[PDB]
Amino acid sequence: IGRYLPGTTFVYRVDPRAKLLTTFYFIIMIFLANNWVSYLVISIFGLAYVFATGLKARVFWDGVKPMIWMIVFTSLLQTFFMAGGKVYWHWWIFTLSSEGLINGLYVFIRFAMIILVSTVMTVTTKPLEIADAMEWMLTPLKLFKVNVGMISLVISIALRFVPTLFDQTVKIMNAQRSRGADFNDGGLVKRAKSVVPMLVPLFIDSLEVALDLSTAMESRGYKGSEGRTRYRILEWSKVDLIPVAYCLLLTILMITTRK
Template sequence: HELGVTWEGVMVGLGMGLRLLIMLWAGIWLLSTMSVEELAQASQQLGLPSRAGFVFSLAFRWVGMLLGAGAGVVQAQRSRGLDVSTGGILQRIRKYVPLVIPLIGHVLRQTNLLAMSLESKGFHPLAKRHFYSAGKLGFRDYAVISVMLILVVVGICLRWQGVGTLDVRF
């Protein structure tokens, strides 16, 4: 069998790439327009358990914390002469060990501090959450939600019609 580029393959690749790009754009847009607290509050207003909002907000905060800690560890190890960009693949993997161990230690310390903080504030995962400011949806919010829902429905209908799929029969 010969491998080649076909029109169908290009269209399927473009469709998959567009789906990935849309999901990435939507995530970036969501995180750039809402604070972590607003995201937790919105998830509770949508009927999700308060624990889900807490988990979302905690996960987003930890991503930033891990990126910052990782950058600090990389700088510290580079100042000690570590160069991870040279050598073969196995050598490069071994060079990352001095980066991972301090990062794990940092994560464990932060987890312990978070647990103590939640315990000292009387956190209970099943307790009803109350927010300082209750956000209300305005006209623009409903307009954006409507447009997004229409786009999702159109995307689902196009998918059912076979647009962006590859019909492979062997």
């Protein structure tokens, strides 16, 4: 892990499909905005999405942190819009302007909006819930050669066994740290070697688990992917009308402000 926690339990956070669609529809709705009332509209909806769904404001810093100073430079670069073309002149041409300032503030809100809607996608949903949604969006390509039975299987196992192989590594790490071992001493020719004492155990293990699982899967009567039911499915709850309204209302507001 990896994060974040599904609610403890907070209100909403239901039906990853609709919320993931709302996540994808919103980042498309982040684009297609030509006015200051456009950026006003898309700002106070994604905003209203956040604290009506109530999360502590401090949890959003974790997503913004890595991209901050580069994106400041983006917004700093485009706050200077000057001489886009026809001036390869003059002296110091670049200068502060409101046109750039409002451009630079556009890019802050245009960029930061994708780290709001998407952050609440991860925070408010289990990883399997997202995967369940992901495989549903993936479905319509069944018409092509792509069988998706094994694609959904490989995903389901990796998502399942990523936690375990992690915890097995720490155990292996501390194991070699006890009889050995120092991992940080300086060198190129030197400390590439330190990877092996964790890796071979982890790879030996990961082979040992692929053995034990493939055997159990068949002793549970796994013939193949073809045509055997499903236990775990997704519903459509009553709460799912909120994101259809929230998405459909904002549509017209964004339409007016685009044009």
